Amino acid sequence: SYDIQAWKKQCEELLNLIFQCEDSEPFRQPVDLLEYPDYRDIIDTPMDFATVRETLEAGNYESPMELCKDVRLIFSNSKAYTPSKRSRIYSMSLRLSAFFEEHISSVLSDYKSALRFHKRNTIT
C-alpha cells in the first residue's frame, strides 16, 4: 500500500456498513440523558457514530488511528455504563466491536505502511 490518503474513503465505507448493522442502533447518536439520567456521572467523554462520521467528513481526523480511538471510546463507554456484562446494549457493542476490529485492521496496517514508505528517505 502506497496511498497515504486511502484510509479516509475506507473509513467512510466501514461507517456505512456499521450504520446498516442493526447492532449499531444504540450507538448511532449521542446517548439520551432522558433515557439514562446519570450517564454523565459515569461517562466523562461521550462518543457515538454520528459524531465520528461528522468528524471524518469535516476533515477533522488526520489518521485512521484517531478515528479508531473514538470508535473504541464508543465501546469502552458502553462497557463502563453497562449494569451487567449480559445486558442487551452491551452485548450489541461486543459484536459490533468485533466487526469493527476485523475491518479496521487492514485500514490501519495499510496506512501505517504507506506512511513508513513516504518517510523511507526522511534522513536523505
Swiss-Prot record:
Q: Which stretch of the intact protein is present?
A: 1315 to 1438 of 1821
- Tree of life domain: Eukaryota
- What role is this protein assigned? Probable regulator of the insulin and insulin-like growth factor signaling pathways. Stimulates cell proliferation through regulation of cyclin transcription and has an anti-apoptotic activity through AKT1 phosphorylation and activation. Plays a role in the regulation of cell morphology and cytoskeletal organization.
Q: What is this protein called?
A: PH-interacting protein
Q: Which disease is it linked to?
A: Chung-Jansen syndrome: An autosomal dominant disorder characterized by developmental delay, intellectual disability, autistic features, anxiety, hypotonia, obesity, and dysmorphic features.
Where in the sequence is Phosphoserine found? S1, S91
What does the subunit section of this Swiss-Prot or TrEMBL entry state? Interacts with IRS1 and IRS2. Interacts (via bromo domain) with acetylated lysine residues on histone H1.4, histone H3 and H4 (in vitro).
List where in the cell it is found. Nucleus
Q: Which residues carry this modification: Phosphothreonine?
A: T45
Q: What is the reported tissue distribution?
A: Expressed in myeloma and epidermoid carcinoma cell lines.
Please state every residue range assigned to the domain named Bromo: 2-107
